[PDB]
Design a protein around this ligand. Structure first.
Ligand SMILES: [Mg+2]
Lengths: 146, 206, 116, 64
RNA sequence: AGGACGACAUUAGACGAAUCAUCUGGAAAGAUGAAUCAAAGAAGGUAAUAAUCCUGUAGUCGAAAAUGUUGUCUCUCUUGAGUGGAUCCUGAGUACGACGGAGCACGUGAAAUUCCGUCGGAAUCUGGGAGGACCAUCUCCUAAGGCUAAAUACUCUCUAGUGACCGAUAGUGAACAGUACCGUGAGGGAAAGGUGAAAAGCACCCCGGAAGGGGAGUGAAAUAGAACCUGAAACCGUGUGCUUACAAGUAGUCAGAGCCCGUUAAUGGGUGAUGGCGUGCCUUUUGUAGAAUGAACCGGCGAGUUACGAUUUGAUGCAAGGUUAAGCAGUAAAUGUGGAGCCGUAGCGAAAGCGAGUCUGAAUAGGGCGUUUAGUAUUUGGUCGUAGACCCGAAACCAGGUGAU
RNA sequence: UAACUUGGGAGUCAGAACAUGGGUGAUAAGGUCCGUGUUCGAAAGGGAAACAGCCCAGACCACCAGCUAAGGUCCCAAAAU
RNA sequence: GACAAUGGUAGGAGAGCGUUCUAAGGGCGUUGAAGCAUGAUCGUAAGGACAUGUGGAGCGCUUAGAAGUGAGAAUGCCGGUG
């Protein structure tokens, strides 16, 4: 483009609505607010969740439960994200990270079995599910809980 | 991807191979528009202000009684409808800059450079050799290899004598391979880049 | 930047003032009353462009009625007979004929009489 | 500034896999003699926040 | 503590390249033609718009004197280790406790932790304190003495600059002022810019007591003459083309003779004998010609904005991935670097937990929520939240002062 | 020729007369409270002298064309003395 | 091209006119810019030109950007004049 012939992508820009600027716009005198009341006043909205005095919803339902501050949570790796490795490889937490399969390892890796393996590997992680460990030791190769 | 390498006189030297990943893509105009809009919005210092009700001098007391005088009810001599003062919603000091993902910044540079190379706006030269700054000498160089009036000169690293010789010519701008921006490239009619600078551009952007 | 009101208000008001040329007193001088009068006159003109078409048709029928009584007919029966004869002349043409050419109107009346 | 969560609401609901909010039931916790056994058994299952209520109270829980 | 010799920086300054002619004009920098300088084509002046006319600019040079830093000498001070380890020393009305309070995000509570008032009141290395009541074991530390730069906050000022900031009802209250003026006092608080390039600011004559004026003269221009650039509207007059003294009106509109003119030249313009129809505008209302509200008239000014979050839609980049924040470098840019962090690729459950399932349940029953892929970053528009949050308006409340002329 | 589902943005919560089925009142009210239609509200045009709510009818803009609705045809004032 | 639709208050949706400033391009101006005054001109509307008089130095056009962006009413504020 030249600097005197700029055009934006079609559909990307749009002009803002200006209210209270005459009758023909459609938003003139009362500016879209209707007639008198609490909602037509400056700074006049009522609080979100307020129901006019009827008991609000989040005070007639009971509280429930607690939160455990020592909760653990694992980085999940399913069984079909291991098909981008070659046979014989030693899949280790240091390798899943650099390979971009795990961004953040929270409490350690945990292997789950959701796809199909179709590879022969030796995997070493923190936790396995029954199906995952079973499916790894079906094409050969083993697993080692570290 | 072949480009002639001229000398400071219009005679030809060897050719050169510039990558088609940098020079030679299909220029994206949406990203160019957004990049130009971004760069130019980041140049303004929004230093402007007005005084509202609170900041105008004086105006503490009530002008007259609420009832009984036959006049309109007023609260202060600095309300907005008074000639005294008090602005309602004017300008306030703020910044206008914003940001784009960096994959888009590189795409904008690549599409601005390739547009010059498809309009025959790119000229590669072997070397600039200026021992002392002399504008009359640079003018003749620019006229020998016929250039338009708006030219952007690009060197590999900062060259004190070349940059100091093209400084007072109207329409000429000098920069470095790493100081390339979308506003300078699209404002120019032609690029005059050296061989080393072209190789350096070909890698950082590739 | 600041946009001060300049020259657009005066030009807009002066157009409306000029449209009120010939009105009585301050109705051709001051903007507010002039604008009200120009609005009202636009509304009147709209309403009257449609009453013109009723007024002139009412005039033609009066003239045809007067011309038909001179041949011992009323407008009612003359139009009935002309329709039964198939003649398709306007009420506007039927009264210009009766004004300018009396013999032609007489011949029309005889045909209207024979179709009854 | 950031928007603030409604803490009393955060202690009472949780978000499901789609955008729904799972909730608990009122008329528990007291006076169980005036109920039949079917009533007591069925007050034990959880429900969802209705769509007409979501419209009102939705910015209250945006960070949950 | 105090001497020496230096080096920078302030506080005045100096030098600093390159143009002529004709036309229009009161005047040229403009137009036309032919030249020149540039490490200087920033800017301001000059009788209109100048890189080459002036002040300057890029660049380079400069201090008798006084300050401020900063070096190198001088100067002035001064030994440093190892083994024994439990013989001696190691901060007392202290630490703690009870009662009444306060501060810690925390409302005295499972309140640990930290301070104040009143009373009580320890131990001594096999010691003492903390790790959210308390006990035991472990782990970390060693109170009741003191000093300490840098990274951080602010601007009445000084120096050099900048602006998709205002342009005389704006911008400071104030371009000429905390002054006129008002009030016993504390205190409140204005209005008011522009001759011309140059004063060349009208010699002299006439009417007039003067003020004002008509000529003459200056000037490109005096309807630029000091109440001085331009000079709108309300409002006040003078002269005229058409019309009006038997007529009942929201003052127009549609039809239409007669009389007068002649245009952005087109089935033109001004006036109007006479006929038809016709109860202003705004707000607020079930409903207003309303005898319901508001406006004497004209001019200026005068009301959904911005920052940071949330959500949804459009656009664009990349895609099982997407993206950086502060910081550092850079011209107060683009950009480069920076992967702490954030969202997504997996859910269910109060939780331990299990996982394409999971919870409930004795149940491999039934049911709830899920699975059988598309996200993410920036930005335009709509709406919401926190902020005065579309604008103007109370009676009142509290704090600190001023008054018994 | 619509209906339903999901999402963005609303305004409304003072109603009135007429016809008809009812309560209340006194088989009073241009009264008051409900059911069922229509019109006004937010609807100009023609008729009902004038007259939001009654009768006929729903205005995109020209025209000095024609046919009809309600209501009308001695003069005011169009059409049958 | 045939056919159909086009009254409207709270209110939803769309497309535009004009004002001040900035960027790039291209122009006009002492042989007279902006402003002001008059006219019998053009466009579906907001609005845009041209000619003449006054005025005496600045101002349009195209594409894009940004807003102190439009007044007839507030017993509105200030000035002037009935
Ligand atoms: Mg007068």
């Amino acid at each position: 483009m030249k600097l005197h012939e700029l055009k934006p992508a079609e559909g990307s820009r749009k002009e803002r609505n200006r209210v209270g600027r005459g009758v023909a716009t459609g938003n003139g005198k009362t500016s879209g607010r209707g007639h008198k009341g609490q909602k037509a006043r400056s700074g006049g909205g009522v609080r979100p969740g307020f129901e006019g005095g009827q008991l609000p919803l989040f005070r007639r339902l009971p509280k429930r439960g607690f939160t455990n501050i020592n909760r653990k949570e694992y980085a999940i790796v399913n069984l079909d994200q291991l098909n981008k490795f070659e046979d014989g490889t030693e899949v280790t937490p240091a390798l899943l990270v650099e390979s971009g399969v795990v961004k953040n390892e929270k409490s350690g890796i945990k292997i789950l079995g959701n796809g199909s393996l179709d590879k022969k590997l030796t995997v070493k992680a923190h936790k396995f599910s029954a199906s995952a460990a079973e499916a790894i030791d079906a094409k050969g190769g083993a697993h080692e809980v570290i | 991807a072949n480009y002639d390498v001229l000398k400071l006189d219009g005679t030809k030297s060897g050719s050169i191979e510039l990558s088609d990943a940098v020079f030679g893509i299909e220029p994206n105009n949406s990203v160019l528009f957004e990049a130009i809009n971004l760069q130019r919005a980041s140049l303004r210092q929004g230093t402007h202000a007005v005084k509202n009700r609170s900041a105008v001098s004086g105006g503490g007391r009530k002008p007259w009684k609420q009832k009984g005088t036959g006049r309109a009810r007023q609260g202060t001599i600095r309300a907005p409808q008074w000639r005294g003062g008090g602005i309602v919603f004017g300008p306030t000091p703020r910044s206008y800059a914003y940001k784009m993902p960096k994959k888009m910044r590189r795409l904008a540079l690549r599409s601005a450079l390739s547009f010059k190379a498809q309009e025959n706006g790119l000229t590669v030269v072997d070397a600039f050799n200026f021992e002392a700054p002399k504008t009359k000498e640079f003018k003749n160089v620019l006229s020998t290899l016929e250039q338009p009036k708006k030219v952007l000169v690009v060197t590999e690293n900062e060259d004190v004598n070349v940059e100091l010789s093209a400084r007072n010519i109207p329409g000429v701008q000098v920069t470095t391979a790493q100081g390339l921006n979308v506003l300078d490239i699209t404002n120019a009619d032609s690029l005059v880049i050296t061989e080393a600078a072209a190789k350096k551009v070909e890698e950082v952007l590739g | 930047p600041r946009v001060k009101g300049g020259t657009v208000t005066r030009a807009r008001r002066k157009k409306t003032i000029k449209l009120a040329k010939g009105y009585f007193g301050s109705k051709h001088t001051l903007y507010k009353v002039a604008k009200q009068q120009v609005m009202k006159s636009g509304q009147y003109a709209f309403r009257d462009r449609r009453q013109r078409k009723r007024d002139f048709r009412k005039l033609w029928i009066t003239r045809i009625n007067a011309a038909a009584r001179q041949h011992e007919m009323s407008y009612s029966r003359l139009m009935n007979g002309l329709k039964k004869a198939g003649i398709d002349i306007n009420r506007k043409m039927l009264s210009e004929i009766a004004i300018s050419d009396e013999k032609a109107f007489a011949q029309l009346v005889t045909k209207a009489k024979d179709a009854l | 500034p950031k928007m603030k969560t409604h803490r009393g609401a955060a202690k009472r609901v949780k978000r499901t896999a789609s955008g729904q909010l799972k909730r608990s039931r009122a008329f528990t916790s007291h006076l169980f003699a005036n109920k039949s056994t079917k009533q007591k058994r069925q007050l034990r299952k959880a429900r969802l926040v209705s769509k007409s209520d979501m419209k009102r109270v939705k910015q209250l829980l945006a960070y949950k």
